[PDB]
Structure 1
Amino acid sequence: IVGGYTCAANSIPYQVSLNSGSHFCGGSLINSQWVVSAAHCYKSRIQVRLGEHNIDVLEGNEQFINAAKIITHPNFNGNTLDNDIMLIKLSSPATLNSRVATVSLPRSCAAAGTECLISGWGNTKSSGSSYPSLLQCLKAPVLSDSSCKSSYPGQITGNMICVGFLEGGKDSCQGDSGGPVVCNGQLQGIVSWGYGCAQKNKPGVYTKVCNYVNWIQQTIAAN
């Protein structure tokens, strides 16, 4: 997260870190047994780390649970990044408490201008590289359809939204991929793609979760 602030510890209790040896992606706990992330995060083996604040220190509230199943959306396209969504079934249920909690799926899509919260352990620098120990947070609004599609001509499908700023400086970045965009209590976005991070007129593009509630629920019921 570039241009954000450090979240209060465990204040994003649905945020997870996906670990393959090191943190590589975010995700969101939506069911006791299921995390949703981005398809471009796929790895064949993933440990899900719940309850984290400092991903470099064991602070006690963590739950480390290996993935049992990893299911990318059948229509993910790695070029266009359409359908950039993946589900991870936990090998045992997460234990839900104040620091580990589910986040609701969307009841509707979000209006333009809706305020959201984006979080992750990704790169914090707009030039160079710094990967934080502590979870970072950013407040950002859902952008207008004209602001989003003008920024990426021909590239915004109906399964994508832009959230962020057209001025440079405030965005998600590498290592935030797969993490949440929560607006009014609902997971509306998954950190997906853009052009670099926090550059002017290149806001973050996010998987539009309100189009995927049926796919999510059907995958959970079947597995």
Structure 2
Amino acid sequence: IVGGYTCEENSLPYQVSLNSGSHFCGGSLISEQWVVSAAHCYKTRIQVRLGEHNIKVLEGNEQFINAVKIIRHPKYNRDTLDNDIMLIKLSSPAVINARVSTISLPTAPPAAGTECLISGWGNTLSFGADYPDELKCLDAPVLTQAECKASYPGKITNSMFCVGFLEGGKDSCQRDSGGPVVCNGQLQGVVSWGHGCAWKNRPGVYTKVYNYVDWIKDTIAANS
């Protein structure tokens, strides 16, 4: 997250860290045993870390659980990042408490102008790299599809939407990938991609979770 602020400890119970030796992507807990993330965050072996704030220090509220099954969307396109969404089943159900809980699925697509909360342990700089130990937060509005397409001519598909500021300065970034975009208490998006980070006229592009509600429900029911 570039230009954001440090979130209050455990204030985003649904935020998870995907770890493969080190943190590499974010995710969202939507059920005791299921996490939503980005398909480009796929890896053969993944440990899901819940209840985290400072990813380098043991705080006492963490829950480390290995993934038993990783399901990328059938139509995921590695080249265009179309349908960039993935489901992760935990080997065991997470213990739900005050610092670890789930986020709801959207009941309608994101509306332009809506303020959302994006979070992660991703890069905090537009140039160079500075990965934070503590979870970062950013409040940003959903942009119109018009503005989104204008920023990325011929690269925006039906599964994508933009959130951020055209003036730049505030945006998600590398390793925030797979993380949540929550608006009005619902998971509206998944951090997917963008050109640079917080650059002018290059807002973040996110996967529209609403388009996959049925797929998520069916896939989970068939693998639980």
Shift of the alpha carbon at 1:55?
0.3
- The aligned runs of 1:106-185 (5 Å cut-off) are 106-185=106-185
Shift of the alpha carbon at 1:221?
0.2
RMSD in angstroms over aligned alpha carbons?
0.5
Shift of the alpha carbon at 1:3?
0.5
> Which aligned runs of 4 or more in structure 1 are off by greater than 2 angstroms?
none
| Residue in structure 2 matched with residue 222 of structure 1 by the alignment | 222
Shift of the alpha carbon at 1:147?
1.1
What letter is aligned with 2:58? Answer: L
Q: How many residues were matched structurally? A: 223
TM-score normalised by L of structure 2: 0.99
For 1:105 and 1:193, the matched residues in 2 are separated by 21
Q: Identity of counterpart residues, as a percentage?
A: 78
Listed as ranges, the gaps of 5+ residues in structure 1 are none
- The aligned runs of 1:180-199 (5 Å cut-off) are 180-199=180-199
For 2:127 and 2:221, the matched residues in 1 are separated by 44
TM-score normalised by L of structure 1: 0.99
Query: 1:52-77: CA deviations, max 9, x gaps?
Result: 00000010000000000000001000
What letter is aligned with 2:194? Answer: G
For 1:203 and 1:168, the matched residues in 2 are separated by 7
For 2:45 and 2:142, the matched residues in 1 are separated by 33
What letter is aligned with 1:95? Answer: V
Shift of the alpha carbon at 1:172?
0.5
- The aligned runs of 1:20-99 (5 Å cut-off) are 20-99=20-99
Query: 1:55-114: CA deviations, max 9, x gaps?
Result: 000100000000000000010001110000010000000111111010000011121000
For 1:94 and 1:214, the matched residues in 2 are separated by 23
